[PDB]
Amino acid sequence: PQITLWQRPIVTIKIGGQLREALLDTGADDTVLEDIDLPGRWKPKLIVGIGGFVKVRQYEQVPIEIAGHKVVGTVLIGPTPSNIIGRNLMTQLGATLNF
Amino acid sequence: PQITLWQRPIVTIKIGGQLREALLDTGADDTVLEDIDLPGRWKPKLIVGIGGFVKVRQYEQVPIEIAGHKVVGTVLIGPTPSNIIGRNLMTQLGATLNF
Ligand SMILES: CCCC[C@@H](CN[C@@H](CCCC)C(=O)N[C@@H](CCC(N)=O)C(=O)N[C@@H](CCCNC(N)=[NH2+])C(N)=O)NC(=O)[C@@H](NC(=O)[C@@H](NC(C)=O)[C@@H](C)O)[C@@H](C)CC
């Protein structure tokens, strides 16, 4: 698609057999979701944004689908005001910013 | 330009007769800079990110140049780990996310 930016750029994703929404965020290194539980082992990871830092769970080699791209990536799980898809997954979609 | 997302998408901007760098952030409603002082009146504004909220100065009708685009927009000034250009200014550049 070609997404315009007068609205927040929200997409549907599929993760752990569940449908969620998330924000395509070029200013995010990583992907953070709050409203899913992921299975298996993880490691603590610290992330930082505009409010300060937050501790999250780093789940590796997670399968995820975004438009109809089936990619595998690190997904962080923890508190965030909005689910966000970061550059770690946007690279895999071949997404670009154009102007 | 077409900007790929394997790196942080950082651009040069010109604001208050000074050159700065900032991150093109589709997950930002607003534009936030920390390393410039702007002149004149402002209004308190709260912004929210990962980690929590922060109090900033809202400066209105600020002129700013991003890649030969001379736009006027709200600029927030306050603490942030990175200067960021939000959708308020990216819309004025006709910027889109494409995949
Ligand atoms: C969660 C809700 C939206 C996502 C968020 C992402 N912004 C970037 C800002 C870039 C840093 C200033 C961010 O946190 N990125 C993180 C996300 C977490 C992540 N792990 O990816 C980041 O890459 N963190 C890296 C660190 C970047 C370090 N960068 C640096 N030092 N320059 C990391 N590994 O933790 N947007 C925001 O934080 C924006 N907020 C908004 O847009 C909100 N609107 C208002 C009006 O406040 C809306 C959420 O209600 C900000 C900028 C104010 C307009």
- Tell me if residue A45 falls in helix, strand or coil: strand
B78: which DSSP letter?
A: S
Domain limits of chain A? 1-99
Nearest to A5 among B2, B4, B87 (CB): B87
Would you call B39 exposed, middle or buried from its count of C-beta atoms within 10 A (0-12, 13-18, 19+)?
exposed
What is the distance in A from the centroid of ligand 1 to the CA of B27? 7
Optimal mutation site among A8, A13, A26, A84, interface B, most CBs of chain B within 10 A: A26
Expressed in Å, this structure's resolution amounts to 1.7
Question: Helix, strand, or coil here: B71?
Answer: strand
CA distance A40 to A79: 19
Interface touch A90/B96, C-beta < 8 Å: no
Residue B76 CA to residue B5 CA, distance in Å, equals 25
Query: Which H or E run includes B87?
Result: helix B87-90
Query: Is A25 marked active-site?
Result: yes
Measured from the Cα of A47, ligand 1's closest atom is 35
Q: Which residues of A touch B (CB under 8 A)?
A: 1-6, 8-9, 23-29, 32, 47-54, 67, 79-82, 84, 87, 90-91, 93-99
Helix (H) or strand (E) holding A10: strand A10-15
Distance CA A73, CA B13 (A): 33
With tokens 């409603």, the residue in question is B29
Cα gap A49→B83, rounded to integer Å: 12
Q: Tell me if B52 and A52 make a contact (CB, 8 A cut-off).
A: yes
CA distance A8 to A42: 30
**Which residue, among B49, B46, B93, has the nearest Cα to B73 in the 3D structure?**
B93
Name the residue among B8, B54, B96 with its Cβ closest to that of A98. B96
Q: Looking at chain B, how many residues does it have?
A: 99
For the domain B1-99, what is the CATH superfamily, name and number? Acid Proteases (2.40.70.10)
Instruction: Give residue A5's Cα distance to chain centre.
Output: 18
Residues in A closer than 8 angstroms to B67, CB to CB, are: 99
Query: What is the nearest CA distance from B52 to chain A, expressed in angstroms?
Result: 4
Q: Find the helix or strand (DSSP H, E) in which A89 lies.
A: helix A87-90
Alpha-carbon distances, residue B67 vs A39, B1, B8, B22, B70 (angstroms): 45, 9, 17, 12, 8
CB atoms within 10 A of CB A93: 18
